[model samples]
Target: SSNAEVIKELNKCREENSMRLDLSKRSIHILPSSIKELTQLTELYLYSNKLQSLPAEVGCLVNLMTLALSENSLTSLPDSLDNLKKLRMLDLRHNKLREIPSVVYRLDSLTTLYLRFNRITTVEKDIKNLSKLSMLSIRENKIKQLPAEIGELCNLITLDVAHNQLEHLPKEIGNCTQITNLDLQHNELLDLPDTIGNLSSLSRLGLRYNRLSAIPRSLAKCSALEELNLENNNISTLPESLLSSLVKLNSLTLARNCFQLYPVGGPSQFSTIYSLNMEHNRINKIPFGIFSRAKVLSKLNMKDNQLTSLPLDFGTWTSMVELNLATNQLTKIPEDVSGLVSLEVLILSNNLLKKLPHGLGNLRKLRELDLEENKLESLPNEIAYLKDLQKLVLTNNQLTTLPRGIGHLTNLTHLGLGENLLTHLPEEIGTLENLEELYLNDNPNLHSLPFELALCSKLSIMSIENCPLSHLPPQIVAGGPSFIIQFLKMQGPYRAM
Candidate 1:
């Protein structure tokens, strides 16, 4: 009906005693004051407009239950809007409003308020009077502080203030017992008050990208919390009690922190954490019995640490799906790691490993193996036993040649052997029919690729920089097939290979 009518239709209905007006997304800008004649209107939708202000006559819509004025250019609301005592929903998303009218809090029956993506600097007095509000989203604003009266909203369930200027919150916020989700990411907050533990109903809390230097001790009181995100912070330590009482926590993130030691008998020690990340830390070692205690941890990351070797019981984590031990001080890895039958992805780059354990090929589900930037002299013949492996990175190592058994990896697609000591590739290398990207750069001794390399008809990208080969397989050179070949030769360490 909004599309079939002109402005006159709305006013005509009011004169005839009709009370509903819907002009949403009609590209109309101004609301005619004549519509004020409709004192009985219960719903008004003027969304997606360019109007900068509302008419004072809008006050006549005293019975309006919903007002949809979202996605507009209005910088402020009319004080007369307070006359709409029955209004329950006010959606002002994507607007230019810098502040809410004080009269807005006077609406006692309003249940939902969305003021996200605005320039609102602060909330005025009486904001606590919105007693029926259940959802409040004020994200992406310039608000630096919330009124202490915020704790009086006993029925509020979800509060999202992510990407705001908030430096701290009121201590009374702990009184909001009905809050289920609290998102405070990307704020100026440095710490949370211990009183937050009073939110007996909180289930999820997002605190990513803040200035927090440590986990708050008060968080231990959140026994009902199920998920907590503390990623991308300067947090250097976590109290053992942070998750000791969080019996339901299944996912926790501590990535990009300065944590030097992990809790040996804390939340991660005894809980059923299916996914846990402690990546990019100053961790030099895992406490002797740490992993053995976490029976339910399925995925773990200890990447970018100072670990010189993995614990002998590293293979004890039977449920691990992925393990990233790359960019560490590992000179040797446990050969028994293959015992992790569920393992799928294993990354061990930028380490001092001379060779992988002989039994590593036993991980039957392994699909990706990254072994670049190591001291490996030769790949084990057992590597061919990885039938499910599709991607293998052996670049920048001391490898002089690949094992003939490598041809057994029938599922291989991406194979990298660049910047190594390889002098020649076995003819069987062409047996990988699914091979797509291959790198052989910086291998100064490589005289040529085996003629059988032509058998890899599915090859897409081939790089052979600094190699002695002046030509490729005959079939490849003649047809100049659909592929990319780069001969970029590095002059320094790459030539040392």
Candidate 2:
């Protein structure tokens, strides 16, 4: 029955003199042999069909240039397809194929071939015959290794073989100098060949989640590289001479490595980098003059390290945007921190900070500030200057009182102040019109809340549990945020202390 409909589509295309025939998503289990009559068709898309076998009659379409049969049940392609010398784009992705069909190697005109999400194990050396091929992606397969002949594809630009069982690449890969994006992430790669330096056009290389212990020094020759991800590897250091050569590098990710010291080399080494993450390392300190030259840095992540202090020179990073120093031993933030003029998100959680620099308010662009699990006793009045502040997390701290200037953060949405030592909240807190979630749990001495708090009509999720509110009725406090707000709104005798 589906074949009849497919034949109908073929007839319709023939009547319109159309060059493209789209039988996609038609649930076609069988293609009609009459499709061969449409010799005028150049592009045929039968994607997401239920066909277990393709009609051999399809080979008669000598004029066909694009054939997309992705998301099908086909176990193999027919050898008759060799007749179509004009076929350039063939997509057989998400199929049950066990290997690259031999007939595919004969398609010399093929430029883009995608056979991803299949049971394919390996491509034969015959693939080298397709000299015109530019993009070859066979990721998410059981492929064990690639033939050295892959290096002969001089026109290749994007080669993605991620999520494979391959442990290494053929050294001949360096011959494909035109490849701009090479993704080998989530593989069992133990190391790369030194000849990788020959890929002069290489720009983006993703080697994350691999078993690589060290990178080949020859990689420093890839001067066109822009983004390099070596995250979650056994790498401890990037040769001091490497970064200074990757002048175009912008985003460098080295998180989850064995680094005890920062990998950056000299002053101008990081001058071109914008985003850098070295989280989950044993690094304790970065050179004092490092940030002085990395003036263009916008995002930096150094969370979960042994860093005890930040250098006073960090103030020169005026272009810094998001900084994550959480889960460290930072005891003090230098007063020069106010120099981060473009600063927005700052995470200092799980640190030993006893006090913040009084110049904190200098970050006028501050948005999200996480100080959870710290030792702060009181916030500075400078915090009030952050009018753009939205999220302020201070849970698990020793804050006895807020600076009252907190009310000036009209954009505040989440306020986490749980597990603190608060005796009373400032009446100005009620001015927070945008307040949505407030965490005031575990404050033993917080007996009464300011009546002005009821003015925050937007407050929906408020936690005042584990506190001694002796002035209010127990039932009203049990009623949650709405009831407490109603009681405070009444301005009754038990409302304000």
Candidate 3:
């Protein structure tokens, strides 16, 4: 009887002393013991309910202060919910709770505890009796270990045990010291308690993956660190006292692992590093002036390392923005990388670039140029000064033609001249007009296509299959990009008569 209509609407909100009572997802399976007559309830949302257990007369409400039984199937809880002395925030997230409900360690006025996901393997050291927990997530969970009395919860400021199967962490978790966001990502953590450099109010530290090979130079005393995610792991080397003690690090993710050299003078004292992800690894030489004091370095991911060249004033970076030298073994490209000019995403796909720096249109804030599988034959007519290019990926190069100022970019939108050695296409390629995806499928001697590309008009994905296009119309090449741009706009001159 829908629990007698949810007990007659919670007895009319307990005789109108109602403080808050959202019986969420009303399929709420049994919770009524008259919900202890509300007792001036102060926030109690039985979240996505099917709640399996809880009514030990819900510890007679006692002015409860927020208790949201998250996505419930809650395995257990009612040990008279420790007489809710005004409990402060407790959301048993997605629960099938394998543990953690010893009346939630007697809820010492809990300050925030969301037992995320849950099948929690272990975390009970009476969770240090919740010394007013400041925020404890317990993400995912099957937690293998972590109760070094969890530093007795010195009012933790945010500690999300990410995923979890945690291999280790309690050097008394550096006595919590008001932690500032510490998500031990994934986990199987090989090592990390050099007193975790005593937290010092850490600023975001996610140990990605983890099997960490080394990195405990007292974590350079955290010093207000700003994002340090040691991606993957098995770190080959980096301890220059943890890169001269972080110095307020600004995003540093050493992707993959086992870096081959290149730590040179340990990240040139970082200077507030601006995102540096050493992709893959096994770097082959880069020591020269090591980022010349990383002057405001801006997002640099040395993709699949072992670089064949670069390090000659690597065009002094000039505050580069996203430069991922894909696959690498660079044959050329260093015309001081056209001095970066705030470059915007340039991933030299599978490098061995044959030619491309006619000051590569002075970067003019390029918007994504990934010369896919390079060995380029030609392309620079000052690439029409890039004009804010929008994605030009010269797919499988050895291009036969293209620089009629590549139709002045005009903010081109995705044009990957698929498998080059092209035989045609350049009535100023219909000045791009914001072209939209044109990957010229394997140019079998690119047979005729530029009816000024039917004036682009945001052409939508046109991949001319195996070329040899005897003047179109095999039903407009099997009706692709709108019947080949409507058979090249009914034979060009923008004809739509």
Candidate 4:
């Protein structure tokens, strides 16, 4: 039916003075002018419709507090929208609006304005007219700059302008003292104004994927900040004052930067920080006792750095659960690592490590351990102490033998030992009843099928290609693990003697 039918239905519902009306996802291209007669209407929804324009009569709904026309084709709004004196929220996201019409500036009662994923090119200085707006999201637009007038929105609690072309923020943004979340990620911002510290209530600030080379010292005033993301920027160093000031911060991401040195002894200045990321930097060494005071730190990521060794006091991070030191130059793991009693996941792949400390087995809580692409000649017998260990990756090493005590990892499921110099398998390997995938490819040493391996009833995947094993028949090697296991079982134990 046409808009006339919708109006007829609205009138019928009007007898009861219904205050809510929903015509969402109806493919409605036009609304009847008679809709203005719904004087009792307070909420209206026309989302996901084909509406190209709303009738000027829409402004007649003076009592409407919420009007949603998101996911439409609206290019502009009616000038009479200023008549909506009681409107508190207006959602026009996913539309083709090139610019906000002046009528929106007159909506002083609007507390929330959502215009995301639009093609808006400019925000007028008159934007300050929305004095009561508490939340404004203009992300994913073509906005090149924000006007100083934005500071007039003193009541705003959240401001998101991410995915835009903003080159810099107006210093006046500091006027939003009540803001708790400010997202400026994926923009062309080269720097921020010192006035940003004026937002004492800010708890989260995201500035990822920008051209920022440094942060302002005034940022230390953000005492209430809890999460700060500066990923994928050109920042070389963070001010020590800023790190010490974020006393309440719990998570900080400084990945993908030009940092040549780990902020020595500065991170410990935080009293509550628990997660820190410094991945993809040029850092070569971690200063001793830098994180000793971070007692609650649990996750630390320093992947893709030049770190050759860890500090002697590294064991002080007892709360660590996940630690990533992959793609570094570390030649050895410090014995102090055993202090990480709560460690669960450790990644040390793509390093120059020739040996692992015997104390590595003290990480009883470890579940995943990746030591691939190292030069290790052998694993410590104490490795079997990790009773909860599941995935163990020791590929591309120089190991020639297996520790018989490795069978103690009853929880082990996936074991990767490919591209090594292994010559034999421990008969006790059959004790891993829970083993599922065992990779032994490219081992160029003496090898013969072990009858005990056939005892792994739960084994599903076993790869042993490129090994110089002459005792095994070609037919058994070509049949894969299942066929090989079957042939080994048929041979029996007495016949092997």
Candidate 5:
């Protein structure tokens, strides 16, 4: 409905003139100036509309307490909008507005303002006059600079400016000492000033997806910070002081950086970091004590790197739950890896692995194990001990046969063995009662599915593409009527075959 229709309907609620008006998601365009006559309106919702501008009389709703005008085509606001003195919450996100009207400074009663995903290029000087503001979200915008007077909003506790074009922050931001959550991700920042350390009340700081080349030494002042995101940045080096002050730090994500070597000496000191991501780097080795002292860490991602082996002191990660080391240069896993009794997910795909450590069978809590793209000739019998295993990824390998013990993984829900050189699957495979999805494609050397596979009552999805099988076994495809099966033929250089 058009804005005119929405307002016309709003007029119908005249019997209860004091009632709030919610006309959101109506594809409204151009709010009529006559809406100013609804003086008793306390809340008005006009989000997800096509509004390009607000009428000057919009400010006449003196009793208005909440206004939502987000997700519209607005380019600018009328100066008279500042007269809504009783307003408390305002949302203007996803608009085409390039600048905030300077008159907004008069809205001293506002507590929350959301301006994310806009085209606003700058924060004007008058914003400092919004004394009562507590939360301001300006993420995903074109804001290249912040007003130096921003520190005047002493009551503000949360500021989100992620995914902007900021190259630097105004020094006055540190003066807003009460802020607890500050998001500055996806920016062009190359460094942080020492003044940022003055934010003593900060608890969560998001700096992910930026151009930060190194951790700022001033960050040590944020002793109260608990969560820090440095994911997908250009940070190749970390200051020794980065963690020295973060005694309470719980989650730190440094995934997808270009660090060629692991942070050898600093990471071990943050004894409270529960989740740590160091994935997708160029690290080829893990030195001793990397996590020997991080006794509380639970989730660790060291995947997609150049690591040929694990550090001999890896057993120190005793409390770990998830571990990813896929796509590396390892020929084998360390025997001590099983010492992590709390381990749940183990990812080791796309590596030079010839065999898995025999001790892996001792991880009773292990659930998902990915061993795809390896040089394994066969799985060990001890694999049967992983009764809790749910998903197993062994695609693109050199396995000639499945271990008879594979039948013991009764809880398996997904089994991926596609693109391998397997000649046969064990007849006992049918005993996997819970198997749901099975992938056996690209294995041109395989003869056929075993007759015993028919016993899998829970099987739903199955594939047999590129296999050299002539016929499908009846029993295996019966209760498996819902099962999927396909055959494929390939003619190419057996690159790894």
Candidate 6:
């Protein structure tokens, strides 16, 4: 019966006249009625406890401005909480509450309320009573619709209701003019109200994983918008009006939609866009003016689109950092690819490339080059210029030999050359000091592996199954990388007696 720790804490608060009290994680199954003794306390934190119910005496802390009861099992709150007239923050995240506590709305001074990860079925109309609330996050709930009265919180600046079953946002949401971040992702929203135009201060809007078929033209009115994510929607068109009105748009992701045609504007119109992800759509052609003003563009990913070839001047994308063009039908890479001097990650796997252009090595920043499942017969010596190359996957190609220069990529950690026409690995493979994973299998004609390969200090994963292992003795053949390493080292030119 030692409520002694609790009593000791209370006695200290009484002596110090402390404005805050933290009784969290003491397995407080129930707060004692003595809480009323701390009437002058301004903040109370009882989170991460097994609080089954709060004592009505909690309301006695009338001076309280913040209360945190997150990670508790509170099924309901005491009605006396309404007496906390100065309360400005209420956090009840990860609770067992089935609905919004009616007493919450009575705390009119609340400026932030977080009810995330609760079983709340609806945000009752009583929400409108918190007119001073600036942030309300009800993410990961069972909510189906937000009450239209939500717009009454004119002072709201951030509203996150993601991961709910909401079918639409109340048009009244537009009335929250001060909202700067509105995250409605992972909902069932079919369309946005034209009234959305009224969120003039909105800077970032996340509507990803929604059922939206068209973007409202009214979105153009949000002049402060800097980032918009509409990935995995049913949208088929890009509103040119929305593009023309974008003054500060920097990032836009429209992947996995139903677009058949989109106006790829030139320099002046796309001067601000820096990242564009338009993967998995029906786009078959990109006009020449596509990347004219791409000086600011850094990441462009159109991986699963229908383009057969890129506009020749695509080489002008020098500022690009990560470019993914996998699973396309292009037979040749842009000859001026060297123009993209800043390219780092280039994924052209599953494309129809018959040969890599000569200037491919100009990307001094290139770290990864994935040419898996392509028609390329050989690699160019210019590849040696990519001193930064770490991972190069050329599996499933027609190459019969690799340039000895491949050994120059000392930084190479992962190399994939399986399913090719290679007859033997270059003994220069020993030069790869950082090699980690090597995937060179399925080439039954490849007869010998260089004993120098054992010199690679970091080599861990090696897949050489289905290749001719006739070069290794039967006893060495029974082992994994360890045995193979032993045999290779035993035959190494650098081997010490």
Q: Per-residue CA lDDT of candidate 3, range 1-497, in tens?
A: 38888888888888887899888888868877977877888898989978788878888888889999899898888788888887899899898999787878988898999988979898778888888888989889798898788898988989998998888787998988889899999988998988988888798999999888988888888888888998998989877756656777888888899989766465456767888898998888777766677788898888988989888887878997898989978898867788889988889898888788788889898788888998998887898988998988888988888889888888888888888888887799897889888888888886668787888877778887777666676677776666777877887777863
State the lDDT of candidate 2 residue by residue for 341-433, as single tens digits: 999999999999989998889999999999999999999988989888999999989988898888899999999999999888897897897
lDDT of 2 at 197: 91
Could you tell which candidate, 1 or 3, scores higher by lDDT? 3
Estimate the TM-score of every prediction: 0.88, 0.97, 0.38, 0.95, 0.88, 0.96
Question: Which segments of candidate 2 are over 4 A away from where they belong?
Answer: 492-497
Decoy 3 TM-score against native: 0.38
Model 5 residue-pair collision total: 1
For model 4, residues 346-379, the per-residue Cα lDDT tens digits are 9999999877899998999999999999899899
lDDT of 2: 0.90
Q: Which is the winner by TM-score between candidate 4 and candidate 5?
A: 4
In the range 129-243, model 1's lDDT, one tens digit per residue, is 8978888889988898998898888888999999998878888788888999999999988888878989878888999888888677788888778778898888887777566
**lDDT to native, each model:** 0.80, 0.90, 0.84, 0.89, 0.81, 0.87
Where is model 6 poorest over a 10-residue stretch in terms of lDDT?
Answer: 261-270
When 3 and 5 are scored with TM-score, the better candidate is 5
lDDT of 3: 0.84
Better of 2 and 4 by lDDT: 2
Q: Scored by Cα lDDT, where does model 5 land? A: 0.81
Better of 3 and 5 by lDDT: 3
Best by TM-score: 2
Better of 2 and 6 by TM-score: 2
Residue 309 Cα positional deviation in candidate 6, in Å, after optimal superposition: 0.6
| Residue pairs with clashing backbones, model 5 | 466-488
Error of 2 at 240 (Å): 2.5
